[PDB]
Design a protein around this motif. Structure first.
Motif, mmCIF file in Angstrom:
data_model
loop_
_atom_site.group_PDB
_atom_site.id
_atom_site.type_symbol
_atom_site.label_atom_id
_atom_site.label_comp_id
_atom_site.label_asym_id
_atom_site.label_seq_id
_atom_site.Cartn_x
_atom_site.Cartn_y
_atom_site.Cartn_z
ATOM 1 N N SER A 1 26.535 -2.471 1.457
ATOM 2 C CA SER A 1 26.213 -2.178 0.262
ATOM 3 C C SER A 1 25.407 -3.352 -0.411
ATOM 4 C CB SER A 1 27.594 -1.842 -0.556
ATOM 5 O OG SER A 1 27.289 -1.439 -1.777
ATOM 6 N N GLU A 2 25.739 -4.430 -0.216
ATOM 7 C CA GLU A 2 24.939 -5.635 -1.136
ATOM 8 C C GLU A 2 23.487 -5.919 -0.478
ATOM 9 O OE1 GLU A 2 27.541 -8.720 -1.179
ATOM 10 O OE2 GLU A 2 29.083 -7.683 -2.719
ATOM 11 N N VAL A 3 23.245 -5.435 0.626
ATOM 12 C CA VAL A 3 22.073 -5.789 1.139
ATOM 13 C C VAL A 3 20.679 -5.591 0.515
ATOM 14 C CG1 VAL A 3 21.635 -4.142 3.096
ATOM 15 C CG2 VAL A 3 20.899 -6.035 3.558
ATOM 16 N N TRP A 4 20.874 -4.433 -0.303
ATOM 17 C CA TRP A 4 19.898 -3.913 -1.023
ATOM 18 C C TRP A 4 19.689 -4.554 -2.359
ATOM 19 C CZ3 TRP A 4 17.725 -0.456 2.197
ATOM 20 C CH2 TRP A 4 18.626 0.067 3.050
ATOM 21 N N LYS A 5 18.540 -5.337 -2.541
ATOM 22 C CA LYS A 5 18.399 -6.218 -3.556
ATOM 23 C C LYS A 5 17.117 -5.626 -4.027
ATOM 24 C CE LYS A 5 19.875 -9.988 -0.656
ATOM 25 N NZ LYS A 5 21.294 -9.893 -1.229
ATOM 26 N N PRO A 6 16.707 -5.802 -5.467
ATOM 27 C CA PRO A 6 15.212 -5.524 -6.113
ATOM 28 C C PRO A 6 14.212 -6.412 -5.649
ATOM 29 C CG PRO A 6 16.457 -6.919 -7.553
ATOM 30 C CD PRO A 6 17.488 -6.713 -6.383
ATOM 31 N N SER A 7 12.984 -5.761 -5.403
ATOM 32 C CA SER A 7 11.937 -6.661 -5.074
ATOM 33 C C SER A 7 10.663 -6.163 -6.208
ATOM 34 C CB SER A 7 11.345 -6.519 -3.547
ATOM 35 O OG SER A 7 10.374 -7.207 -3.308
ATOM 36 N N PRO A 8 10.351 -4.955 -6.168
ATOM 37 C CA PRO A 8 9.185 -4.513 -7.192
ATOM 38 C C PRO A 8 10.191 -4.342 -8.384
ATOM 39 C CG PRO A 8 9.734 -2.925 -5.436
ATOM 40 C CD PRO A 8 10.845 -3.558 -5.203
ATOM 41 N N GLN A 9 9.407 -4.725 -9.401
ATOM 42 C CA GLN A 9 9.877 -4.486 -10.792
ATOM 43 C C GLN A 9 8.756 -4.055 -11.622
ATOM 44 O OE1 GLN A 9 12.038 -8.302 -11.817
ATOM 45 N NE2 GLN A 9 13.840 -7.271 -11.542
ATOM 46 N N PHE B 1 12.247 3.637 -7.598
ATOM 47 C CA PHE B 1 11.578 2.653 -7.049
ATOM 48 C C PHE B 1 11.870 1.363 -7.529
ATOM 49 C CE2 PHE B 1 9.351 6.515 -5.774
ATOM 50 C CZ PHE B 1 9.394 6.452 -4.240
ATOM 51 N N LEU B 2 12.209 1.156 -8.744
ATOM 52 C CA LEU B 2 12.201 -0.104 -9.353
ATOM 53 C C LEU B 2 13.341 -0.668 -9.422
ATOM 54 C CD1 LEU B 2 9.553 0.286 -12.182
ATOM 55 C CD2 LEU B 2 9.142 -0.894 -9.996
ATOM 56 N N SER C 1 0.839 -1.264 0.065
ATOM 57 C CA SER C 1 0.070 0.033 -0.030
ATOM 58 C C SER C 1 0.844 1.266 -0.204
ATOM 59 C CB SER C 1 -1.165 0.034 1.319
ATOM 60 O OG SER C 1 -1.734 1.264 1.228
ATOM 61 N N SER C 2 1.813 1.405 0.913
ATOM 62 C CA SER C 2 2.610 2.643 1.163
ATOM 63 C C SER C 2 3.469 2.810 -0.098
ATOM 64 C CB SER C 2 3.381 2.748 2.365
ATOM 65 O OG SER C 2 4.018 1.383 2.615
ATOM 66 N N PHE C 3 4.364 1.528 -0.619
ATOM 67 C CA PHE C 3 4.920 1.649 -1.775
ATOM 68 C C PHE C 3 4.025 2.321 -2.969
ATOM 69 C CE2 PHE C 3 5.968 -0.526 -5.678
ATOM 70 C CZ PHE C 3 7.347 0.001 -6.207
ATOM 71 N N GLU C 4 2.949 1.416 -3.314
ATOM 72 C CA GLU C 4 2.196 2.066 -4.415
ATOM 73 C C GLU C 4 1.638 3.261 -4.427
ATOM 74 O OE1 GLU C 4 -0.617 -1.015 -5.601
ATOM 75 O OE2 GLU C 4 1.114 -2.731 -5.927
ATOM 76 N N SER C 5 1.428 3.772 -3.172
ATOM 77 C CA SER C 5 0.783 5.250 -2.749
ATOM 78 C C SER C 5 1.976 6.373 -2.990
ATOM 79 C CB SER C 5 0.118 5.109 -1.318
ATOM 80 O OG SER C 5 -0.354 6.630 -1.117
ATOM 81 N N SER C 6 3.154 6.243 -2.337
ATOM 82 C CA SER C 6 4.125 7.353 -2.391
ATOM 83 C C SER C 6 4.822 7.030 -3.502
ATOM 84 C CB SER C 6 4.894 6.889 -1.246
ATOM 85 O OG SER C 6 5.221 5.715 -1.248
ATOM 86 N N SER C 7 4.836 6.125 -4.350
ATOM 87 C CA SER C 7 5.616 6.081 -5.762
ATOM 88 C C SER C 7 4.651 6.402 -6.772
ATOM 89 C CB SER C 7 6.233 4.733 -5.893
ATOM 90 O OG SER C 7 5.557 3.731 -6.216
#
Ligand code: HEM
Ligand code: HEM
Ligand code: HEM
Ligand code: HEM
Ligand code: HEM
Ligand code: HEM
Lengths: 140, 140, 140, 140, 140, 140, 140, 140, 140, 140
Positions: free
Chosen positions: I98-106, I61-62, I31-37
């Motif tokens: 640095s590597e802990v950040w991975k993609p989730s939304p595409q 965001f992607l 919800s917050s992702f799709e609302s703020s982005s």
């Protein structure tokens, strides 16, 4: 002259582990885990529960000896692309193959409902993982 | 005297991988992937979905083991023009051949609709890629 | 004593590549490219279009594996006049022979209308270019 | 003890090239060039024009592979009076024999009207020029 | 032990060139030049003119390959009195024998009216001058 | 600390020579040469001729002091891109600017019919070329 | 301590050249070239032709002083990402900026029909390119 | 003592580039590209087409100056986690920021239909990327 | 004397990041992702779907800029117990952060339905993560 | 001279942590955990269950941030009797204080029924544990 033999042995152990992981052997769901280990889950009041221990061997099933299949095969893939001529890479990937085994089923924590897990002490995967971990133990 | 043998082995492995990549073997689209892996895509409510896992072997199909065909063949082309007498080039192109394999199909992400992907653990490409990654593992 | 052998091998590979490039083998126009690759160009709406992929092998035809004929033959001519006794010249002309292959046909980019291109993976030019790139891989 | 052999080989290659250049072989005017190469000059609208390429082999005729006969024979004359015992003179005259070949006919540039040119890839001159350029590739 | 052989060879080449220059061979006036070269002088409008080229071999006759007979024989006389045990004298007189050949007849410049010139590529003088220039190519 | 000053002086001299060559000053055709030099061409019997020398100053016009304009401006262009911090480049481009001046008009050879030539001792180009040749005379 | 100043000067010169190339200044087509140079193209018999030279200054327009705009801006882009603290990068990219200027219009070759070219001696680009070529001339 | 300043400058440049990339500035689709560049796409016969060039500035839009937004922001993210105290990391990430700019629109290749691209020479991103590439140029 | 300052700065950055992670700021659900982005998910036929991109900023965001909250806070906990006096620990935990950040939304993969993710470029977490990654960049 | 200060700081931090652990602050049972964290346990079908996450801050409560009280106070007792003048003891007891924090409550695992746990990020214990872990970070 021993670093070449160490590298070849490491690669052979990784390839054998990969061969057996591709076939899916040593992977358990809730059904296969609770069937082959003999552990029966009783759902006491109300939101928790417990496994009924009938023999002490079952304690091995409740130890830190489970890894995610995708994580393990990805670890194998990335390990095959290392400079095993160096001691540093051997140490690092040895620690990675040793620490990938985490606990999932416990006495008061039931095996996950739908996920699969890899058993460190499966009859087929155990010798391969042992030989793999031992192959890194070669220094100069 | 071993650097020459290492160079020859590296070039031979690259040439064999190129020979099999030219014929297109080990390349999958959605149809061939879902046919050979047995994974069936069910469209749960409502815009997402998931693959139905029937045996744990299918987990290999959902790992980080897929590469773009054009990227992989360009990697081979550019790698054939390196000074493999040096350790640096060997390390770098080994990391390149190891990192080119990324995940594309996942449990909640269906195989791309129209693109093609190269399977790291295809029955034909697996030994070639393994021998290639191992050929760089020679230091002085 | 190995630099002489390296020089002779480099010169022989360059001469063989020149012999086959002079005869024009491995050079394609739009007609020959679309005929031998099986790629059919459909002119979708409205000013663009795309190639219809029937087998994944065709992806090799759409990679960075094409060079201008005049540029390549001039590269060979100028390379024949180098001091290949030095490692520096070997490295430089190896990088030149490796980077001359650029992309021209793509899935959404049709082969040029009137120009000619040299195919890196032509059945005749492929072994010559491979042996040429391997001849530079000799250090002291 | 190899510098003497290098000098003798260089002198022999220069003398053979001179023997064939004295007889005038490998020299083309516009008529002989456009007849033997099959390149037909069409005068498109209106004051310019272009050559009609019928086979890709003809591209060799349009590369940087032409030298003025007087300039080339003067280069041979002056080269015969060098101290080829030194590596520097070998390198310098090798670069001179490599840079003497410039382009004259192009796709949009017709062969000169009245001048004569020496073809780098003439069936007789090609091996002599190649062996000459290779004779300088000798270090100590 | 090779400096003595170099000196003797240089002296022998100078003596052979002198023997053939004494007989006057290789010297041309306007009549003999235009007769043996086949070049016919046409007097175009109005005070100039040009040679009519019938074969490209004639271009060799119009290069920088002509020397004054008196200057050349004086060069031989003074060269016979040098310390050829030294590399410096060898280099200097080699450059002198190489630079004495200058152009005089050109496509638009007729052979001098009354003077005589020595042809570098005369059938008899060519091997002697070549061997002489090559005899200086010996270092220690 | 003097090489920087030498580099700046060399670049300034090249830029000044380029500035004056751009305007075309010091470039002569047959008309301007025969008008400004006072040399009158008489067409003696029958296809040749000669210039009538009235003052000895005209002899400077008949020396080795003429260069092709395009070749000279190309020499300047390529010279501006050299590593003049090095002595080697200074020596080489100094020799290039010194050797570009060849003879064209002679007592019995008329100025070329249609070409242009650059006069080494033109009132404007003489000081620029002199300062340029002198700027390279700085060693360590 | 001077390498920092050399790097800053190189970067500033590249940035200024980029700023002026972005607006397209110094770029000519056939119309602008033939208009600003005063060269008039007459289409002689029959498929060729020639430019009518009225002053020798126009020879600068017919020299090796033209570069492709896309090639030049790509050279600038890739050059901005170099380690100019090193002498090697300075030398290499200096040679690249010096050799990018090739000939296109000649006395018997008309300016290309549709392409654009960058004039090395354009009133705005000339000082920028000169300062750029001079900025690399700093060694240690 | 200068490596700390170099690290701080590198981090500041990366942070500024990230600040402007987060807002999406400098990213173009087909509409915005063809609108701001003035290039109009004409669909010639029949499945291809071309952009109509009206001013030479548009050539900058057709160079190798486009990068994927996601790839570029991921490059920034991963670059922020490097040991820039080392020269090696500086060189590597400089090459990464230099090579991310590839060509996408060409004279005969229209801007992609739905994808977005990052313009290397956008009025806002150009100075930031330039300062970023220049910040790595600090050695010891 | 600088290692103490480096350690103190690292600890301060870790503590500030922990302070903001405890409050939960920068964590998003679907919800917050799709609302703020501003990204709207359309569920096309039938099991897949896509986000509708309205501005290029949404591409951030992607990207690969999402981490599991529990994994990140555990990383902080384990990092606080390291010997940051050593360079090795700094390098390792820097690479981990640095590597802990991975993609989730595409673009074709919707944000997870119920899980939470940590946004690398959240307005509050971004400066803290940047300062943390920069604090490790101190060598001796 | 800094080892004494390091020892005193370590002892002071251990004493402060002991002072707060004696009073029992920062220790939670199921009631206090579920009250202060706001996490409500819902007993889904049938023997398992899950916590209801209402804000992302609660994720800190489900991380690896819990230690057994007896184990922690025994660790403090045994640590107070170490030779902290040595680097080895500092490293070892730092790792001990870092690894004593394990996870106990999870998303699918309710807080233990009757046992107590010590919260790593309790408002009072957090600064003491942070300062303690930082006090060991002093090397020589
Ligand atoms: C001496 C030991 C060295 C080691 C162990 C080493 C290791 C590496 C590694 C692991 C990579 C990453 C390769 C990849 O991501 O595919 C790399 C890349 C690179 N290294 Fe080194 N390096 C060394 C020395 C150097 C030095 C001294 C230089 C330059 C002065 C250098 C230049 C480069 C470059 C340019 C790349 C980028 C290659 C690319 O395009 O991916 N290396 N190196
Ligand atoms: C010592 C190790 C060296 C290495 C590994 C090296 C490597 C290279 C490379 C990779 C290129 C580019 C070749 C291409 O893109 O086609 C190049 C070009 C060049 N290098 Fe070096 N280089 C070295 C030393 C030097 C030095 C010390 C100099 C001069 C003092 C030099 C002069 C040149 C020149 C003039 C070129 C341009 C060649 C051309 O026109 O394409 N090199 N070098
Ligand atoms: C020590 C290593 C040296 C190298 C690698 C070298 C290389 C070269 C090269 C590549 C050329 C160009 C040849 C051509 O364009 O055909 C050249 C020309 C030349 N070099 Fe050097 N050089 C060296 C030493 C020297 C020194 C120390 C001097 C003078 C003190 C020198 C004097 C010359 C001259 C006069 C030329 C002009 C030759 C001509 O007229 O074509 N060289 N050299
Ligand atoms: C050490 C290496 C040397 C080399 C490679 C060398 C090279 C040359 C060259 C190329 C010439 C011109 C030859 C000609 O144009 O016909 C020459 C002439 C000359 N050199 Fe040297 N030189 C060297 C040392 C010396 C030294 C140290 C001296 C005096 C101390 C010297 C004295 C002369 C003289 C007097 C001439 C004039 C010869 C004549 O009248 O034609 N040389 N040398
Ligand atoms: C001397 C230069 C060294 C360098 C450049 C280096 C580099 C690295 C790198 C790049 C990693 C990966 C960290 C990550 O992926 O998060 C790593 C991890 C590691 N290194 Fe080193 N290392 C060095 C020395 C050593 C030595 C001598 C040892 C042991 C004797 C060692 C033990 C480890 C271990 C155990 C890890 C695993 C850390 C983890 O759990 O992620 N390192 N090192
Ligand atoms: C010289 C550098 C050394 C380093 C960096 C080092 C590092 C370590 C580390 C990381 C541990 C694990 C602590 C834990 O798990 O809590 C440890 C434990 C230990 N080390 Fe070392 N060590 C070193 C030297 C030595 C040596 C030379 C010896 C003995 C001859 C030694 C004896 C021990 C013992 C007995 C333990 C077990 C402590 C326990 O009961 O947990 N250490 N060391």
């Amino acid at each position: 002259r021993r670093v070449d033999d160490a590298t070849v042995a490491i690669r052979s152990a990784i390839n054998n582990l990969i061969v057996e992981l591709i076939r899916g052997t040593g992977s358990y769901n809730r059904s296969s885990f609770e069937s082959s280990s003999g552990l029966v889950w009783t759902s006491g009041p109300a939101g928790e529960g417990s496994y009924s221990i009938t023999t002490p061997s079952q304690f091995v099933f409740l130890s830190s000896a489970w890894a995610d299949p995708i994580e393990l095969i990805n670890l194998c893939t990335n390990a095959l692309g290392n400079q095993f001529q160096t001691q540093h890479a051997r140490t690092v990937v040895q620690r990675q193959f040793s620490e990938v085994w985490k606990p999932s089923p416990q006495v008061t924590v039931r095996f996950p409902d739908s996920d699969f897990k890899v058993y460190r002490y499966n009859a087929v995967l155990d010798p391969l993982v042992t030989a793999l971990l031992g192959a890194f133990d070669t220094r100069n």
